[PDB]
Amino acid sequence: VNSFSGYLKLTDNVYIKNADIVEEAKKVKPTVVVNAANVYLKHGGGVAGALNKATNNAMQVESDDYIATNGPLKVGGSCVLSGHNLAKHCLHVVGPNVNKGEDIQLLKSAYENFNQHEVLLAPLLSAGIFGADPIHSLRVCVDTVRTNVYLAVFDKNLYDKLVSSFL
Ligand SMILES: O[C@@]1(CNc2ncnc3[nH]ccc23)CO[C@H]2C[C@@H]1C2
Ligand SMILES: [Cl-]
């Protein structure tokens, strides 16, 4: 039993809710919140820009030190950093950004990072400003993640389409 509330159960381990991941994180304080990161951990917009703003830019400061030490992530890769005031940990995961021409096949690799964590609050990878089809992202999520994932979908119209089209 965990403290996530109001989610529709898609599968044994995947749950979905129309919610602002920032507000969800501030309520639940999950062990792990997933960020829709880019390889540079430049949290300018989308989910990343919103999560960073909620940390008063502390996420960006920590991220810049991480990059200065380790260099960029790989597309499909991840790193674990602090969750600041939002969660214990933030798993920064880089899905392919279609608006950059990155291979959508890397989306499965991106979701595989979730399997290293028993429970996660997460957005759909590569959705929104990363330019992938969110229906496809949900399908890859369900077919790849085996741990318990609670998906927050900000757009209510998108949330309804994801549920009504789910196979
Ligand atoms: O859910 C999407 C990804 N962006 C987010 N998801 C959850 N909480 C969020 N908080 C801020 C941004 C944000 C996927 O497609 C459309 C609907 C949005 C963009
Ligand atoms: Cl977005």
mmCIF file of C-alpha atoms and ligand atoms in Angstrom:
data_model
loop_
_atom_site.group_PDB
_atom_site.id
_atom_site.type_symbol
_atom_site.label_atom_id
_atom_site.label_comp_id
_atom_site.label_asym_id
_atom_site.label_seq_id
_atom_site.Cartn_x
_atom_site.Cartn_y
_atom_site.Cartn_z
ATOM 1 C CA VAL A 1 0.000 0.000 0.000
ATOM 2 C CA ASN A 2 1.219 3.494 -0.929
ATOM 3 C CA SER A 3 -0.164 7.035 -0.745
ATOM 4 C CA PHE A 4 -1.009 7.700 -4.408
ATOM 5 C CA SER A 5 -4.664 8.693 -4.802
ATOM 6 C CA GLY A 6 -7.151 8.981 -7.648
ATOM 7 C CA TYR A 7 -5.253 6.924 -10.240
ATOM 8 C CA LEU A 8 -6.826 4.664 -12.835
ATOM 9 C CA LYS A 9 -5.205 1.216 -12.885
ATOM 10 C CA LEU A 10 -4.077 0.332 -16.406
ATOM 11 C CA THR A 11 -2.182 -2.881 -15.626
ATOM 12 C CA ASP A 12 -0.777 -4.840 -12.721
ATOM 13 C CA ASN A 13 1.870 -2.147 -12.187
ATOM 14 C CA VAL A 14 0.937 0.998 -14.186
ATOM 15 C CA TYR A 15 -1.445 3.675 -12.900
ATOM 16 C CA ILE A 16 -2.467 6.930 -14.621
ATOM 17 C CA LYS A 17 -3.961 10.232 -13.433
ATOM 18 C CA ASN A 18 -4.749 13.663 -14.840
ATOM 19 C CA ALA A 19 -2.440 15.667 -12.609
ATOM 20 C CA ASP A 20 0.299 18.272 -12.473
ATOM 21 C CA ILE A 21 3.399 16.240 -11.601
ATOM 22 C CA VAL A 22 4.720 19.202 -9.600
ATOM 23 C CA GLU A 23 1.584 19.345 -7.460
ATOM 24 C CA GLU A 24 1.471 15.537 -7.258
ATOM 25 C CA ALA A 25 5.077 15.407 -6.049
ATOM 26 C CA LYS A 26 4.488 18.136 -3.461
ATOM 27 C CA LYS A 27 1.568 16.121 -2.047
ATOM 28 C CA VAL A 28 2.918 12.558 -2.108
ATOM 29 C CA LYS A 29 6.642 13.241 -1.596
ATOM 30 C CA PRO A 30 7.434 9.967 -3.400
ATOM 31 C CA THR A 31 10.679 8.082 -3.058
ATOM 32 C CA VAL A 32 11.325 8.824 -6.756
ATOM 33 C CA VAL A 33 10.004 11.477 -9.122
ATOM 34 C CA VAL A 34 11.070 11.132 -12.757
ATOM 35 C CA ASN A 35 12.214 14.201 -14.672
ATOM 36 C CA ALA A 36 11.884 14.478 -18.452
ATOM 37 C CA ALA A 37 15.537 15.476 -18.758
ATOM 38 C CA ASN A 38 17.796 16.329 -21.666
ATOM 39 C CA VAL A 39 21.412 15.168 -21.907
ATOM 40 C CA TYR A 40 22.713 18.495 -20.553
ATOM 41 C CA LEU A 41 20.297 18.555 -17.599
ATOM 42 C CA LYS A 42 19.227 22.029 -18.757
ATOM 43 C CA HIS A 43 15.785 22.228 -17.169
ATOM 44 C CA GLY A 44 14.375 25.051 -19.245
ATOM 45 C CA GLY A 45 10.843 24.020 -20.130
ATOM 46 C CA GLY A 46 8.316 21.241 -20.173
ATOM 47 C CA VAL A 47 8.201 18.959 -17.154
ATOM 48 C CA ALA A 48 11.863 19.699 -16.402
ATOM 49 C CA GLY A 49 11.384 23.456 -16.367
ATOM 50 C CA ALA A 50 8.368 23.063 -14.084
ATOM 51 C CA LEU A 51 10.051 20.685 -11.618
ATOM 52 C CA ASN A 52 13.123 22.891 -11.436
ATOM 53 C CA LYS A 53 11.047 26.035 -10.775
ATOM 54 C CA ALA A 54 9.339 24.257 -7.878
ATOM 55 C CA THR A 55 12.799 23.636 -6.336
ATOM 56 C CA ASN A 56 13.664 27.350 -6.533
ATOM 57 C CA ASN A 57 16.411 26.434 -9.099
ATOM 58 C CA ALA A 58 18.183 24.085 -6.656
ATOM 59 C CA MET A 59 17.675 21.230 -9.134
ATOM 60 C CA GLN A 60 19.507 23.229 -11.815
ATOM 61 C CA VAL A 61 22.387 24.121 -9.470
ATOM 62 C CA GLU A 62 22.849 20.469 -8.514
ATOM 63 C CA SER A 63 22.546 19.417 -12.156
ATOM 64 C CA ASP A 64 25.207 21.867 -13.351
ATOM 65 C CA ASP A 65 27.656 20.423 -10.820
ATOM 66 C CA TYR A 66 26.759 16.901 -12.001
ATOM 67 C CA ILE A 67 27.452 17.793 -15.655
ATOM 68 C CA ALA A 68 30.674 19.632 -14.805
ATOM 69 C CA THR A 69 31.929 16.434 -13.144
ATOM 70 C CA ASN A 70 30.492 13.698 -15.370
ATOM 71 C CA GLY A 71 29.644 15.213 -18.742
ATOM 72 C CA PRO A 72 26.325 14.784 -20.528
ATOM 73 C CA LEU A 73 23.995 11.842 -20.217
ATOM 74 C CA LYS A 74 23.217 9.531 -23.129
ATOM 75 C CA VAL A 75 19.886 9.681 -24.915
ATOM 76 C CA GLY A 76 18.088 6.753 -23.292
ATOM 77 C CA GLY A 77 20.141 7.151 -20.110
ATOM 78 C CA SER A 78 19.537 8.492 -16.632
ATOM 79 C CA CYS A 79 21.056 9.644 -13.383
ATOM 80 C CA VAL A 80 19.778 9.751 -9.802
ATOM 81 C CA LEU A 81 20.008 13.134 -8.072
ATOM 82 C CA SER A 82 18.260 14.757 -5.131
ATOM 83 C CA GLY A 83 14.496 15.181 -5.156
ATOM 84 C CA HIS A 84 14.878 18.455 -3.209
ATOM 85 C CA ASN A 85 11.501 19.517 -1.750
ATOM 86 C CA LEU A 86 9.546 17.297 -4.171
ATOM 87 C CA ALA A 87 10.712 13.723 -3.507
ATOM 88 C CA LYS A 88 13.537 11.802 -1.891
ATOM 89 C CA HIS A 89 15.236 11.309 -5.270
ATOM 90 C CA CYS A 90 14.825 12.598 -8.791
ATOM 91 C CA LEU A 91 15.528 10.118 -11.585
ATOM 92 C CA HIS A 92 16.505 12.296 -14.563
ATOM 93 C CA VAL A 93 15.669 10.222 -17.662
ATOM 94 C CA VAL A 94 16.464 11.287 -21.230
ATOM 95 C CA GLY A 95 13.898 10.149 -23.749
ATOM 96 C CA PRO A 96 14.515 10.878 -27.427
ATOM 97 C CA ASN A 97 13.470 14.386 -28.509
ATOM 98 C CA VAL A 98 11.719 13.966 -31.870
ATOM 99 C CA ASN A 99 12.068 17.707 -32.496
ATOM 100 C CA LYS A 100 15.857 17.073 -32.500
ATOM 101 C CA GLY A 101 15.666 14.046 -34.828
ATOM 102 C CA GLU A 102 16.575 11.489 -32.154
ATOM 103 C CA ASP A 103 15.769 7.820 -32.717
ATOM 104 C CA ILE A 104 12.376 6.980 -31.197
ATOM 105 C CA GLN A 105 13.596 3.403 -30.660
ATOM 106 C CA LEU A 106 15.605 4.809 -27.723
ATOM 107 C CA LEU A 107 12.316 5.347 -25.867
ATOM 108 C CA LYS A 108 12.316 1.726 -24.695
ATOM 109 C CA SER A 109 15.862 2.127 -23.362
ATOM 110 C CA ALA A 110 14.759 5.283 -21.525
ATOM 111 C CA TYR A 111 11.873 3.462 -19.823
ATOM 112 C CA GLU A 112 14.189 0.586 -18.796
ATOM 113 C CA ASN A 113 15.754 2.979 -16.277
ATOM 114 C CA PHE A 114 12.475 2.870 -14.323
ATOM 115 C CA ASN A 115 13.037 -0.825 -13.530
ATOM 116 C CA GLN A 116 15.835 0.083 -11.114
ATOM 117 C CA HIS A 117 13.238 1.623 -8.742
ATOM 118 C CA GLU A 118 10.389 -0.215 -7.054
ATOM 119 C CA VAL A 119 7.922 2.715 -7.275
ATOM 120 C CA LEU A 120 8.020 5.961 -9.290
ATOM 121 C CA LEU A 121 5.943 9.046 -10.029
ATOM 122 C CA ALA A 122 6.612 9.853 -13.674
ATOM 123 C CA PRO A 123 5.552 11.699 -16.813
ATOM 124 C CA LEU A 124 5.193 9.980 -20.151
ATOM 125 C CA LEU A 125 8.681 10.005 -21.636
ATOM 126 C CA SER A 126 9.235 11.915 -24.879
ATOM 127 C CA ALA A 127 5.720 13.409 -24.691
ATOM 128 C CA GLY A 128 4.990 17.128 -24.716
ATOM 129 C CA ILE A 129 7.839 19.227 -26.117
ATOM 130 C CA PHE A 130 9.945 16.133 -26.886
ATOM 131 C CA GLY A 131 7.520 15.604 -29.779
ATOM 132 C CA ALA A 132 6.672 11.886 -29.601
ATOM 133 C CA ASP A 133 3.180 10.404 -29.791
ATOM 134 C CA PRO A 134 1.986 10.108 -26.157
ATOM 135 C CA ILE A 135 -0.180 7.087 -27.028
ATOM 136 C CA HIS A 136 2.973 5.348 -28.257
ATOM 137 C CA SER A 137 4.895 6.455 -25.173
ATOM 138 C CA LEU A 138 2.223 4.908 -22.944
ATOM 139 C CA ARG A 139 2.394 1.657 -24.918
ATOM 140 C CA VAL A 140 6.182 1.481 -24.553
ATOM 141 C CA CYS A 141 5.853 2.251 -20.844
ATOM 142 C CA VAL A 142 3.376 -0.581 -20.263
ATOM 143 C CA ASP A 143 5.454 -3.023 -22.325
ATOM 144 C CA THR A 144 8.803 -2.079 -20.701
ATOM 145 C CA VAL A 145 8.360 -1.014 -17.081
ATOM 146 C CA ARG A 146 7.860 -3.855 -14.598
ATOM 147 C CA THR A 147 8.061 -1.812 -11.391
ATOM 148 C CA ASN A 148 5.155 0.258 -10.076
ATOM 149 C CA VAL A 149 4.740 3.470 -12.062
ATOM 150 C CA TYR A 150 2.260 6.267 -11.369
ATOM 151 C CA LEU A 151 1.911 8.407 -14.498
ATOM 152 C CA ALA A 152 0.866 12.047 -14.200
ATOM 153 C CA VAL A 153 -0.636 13.509 -17.383
ATOM 154 C CA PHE A 154 -0.996 17.290 -17.185
ATOM 155 C CA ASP A 155 -3.379 17.788 -20.110
ATOM 156 C CA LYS A 156 -6.903 16.644 -19.236
ATOM 157 C CA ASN A 157 -7.847 16.278 -22.901
ATOM 158 C CA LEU A 158 -4.780 14.096 -23.474
ATOM 159 C CA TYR A 159 -5.515 12.068 -20.339
ATOM 160 C CA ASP A 160 -8.987 11.159 -21.618
ATOM 161 C CA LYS A 161 -7.646 10.105 -25.026
ATOM 162 C CA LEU A 162 -4.938 7.928 -23.445
ATOM 163 C CA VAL A 163 -7.475 6.006 -21.350
ATOM 164 C CA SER A 164 -10.124 5.674 -24.063
ATOM 165 C CA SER A 165 -7.580 4.349 -26.575
ATOM 166 C CA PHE A 166 -5.711 2.016 -24.215
ATOM 167 C CA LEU A 167 -5.497 -1.579 -25.381
HETATM 168 O O1 LIG B 1 1.853 15.359 -19.789
HETATM 169 C C1 LIG B 1 2.543 16.020 -20.840
HETATM 170 C C2 LIG B 1 4.024 16.307 -20.369
HETATM 171 N N1 LIG B 1 4.231 17.451 -19.471
HETATM 172 C C3 LIG B 1 3.882 17.452 -18.117
HETATM 173 N N2 LIG B 1 3.337 16.324 -17.589
HETATM 174 C C4 LIG B 1 3.000 16.330 -16.258
HETATM 175 N N3 LIG B 1 3.117 17.324 -15.371
HETATM 176 C C5 LIG B 1 3.671 18.442 -15.922
HETATM 177 N N4 LIG B 1 3.905 19.611 -15.177
HETATM 178 C C6 LIG B 1 4.467 20.516 -16.112
HETATM 179 C C7 LIG B 1 4.585 19.925 -17.360
HETATM 180 C C8 LIG B 1 4.077 18.598 -17.269
HETATM 181 C C9 LIG B 1 2.433 15.241 -22.229
HETATM 182 O O2 LIG B 1 1.769 15.897 -23.299
HETATM 183 C C10 LIG B 1 1.275 17.179 -23.059
HETATM 184 C C11 LIG B 1 0.534 17.122 -21.695
HETATM 185 C C12 LIG B 1 1.893 17.407 -21.013
HETATM 186 C C13 LIG B 1 2.431 18.000 -22.368
HETATM 187 CL CL CL B 2 6.023 18.914 -21.912
#
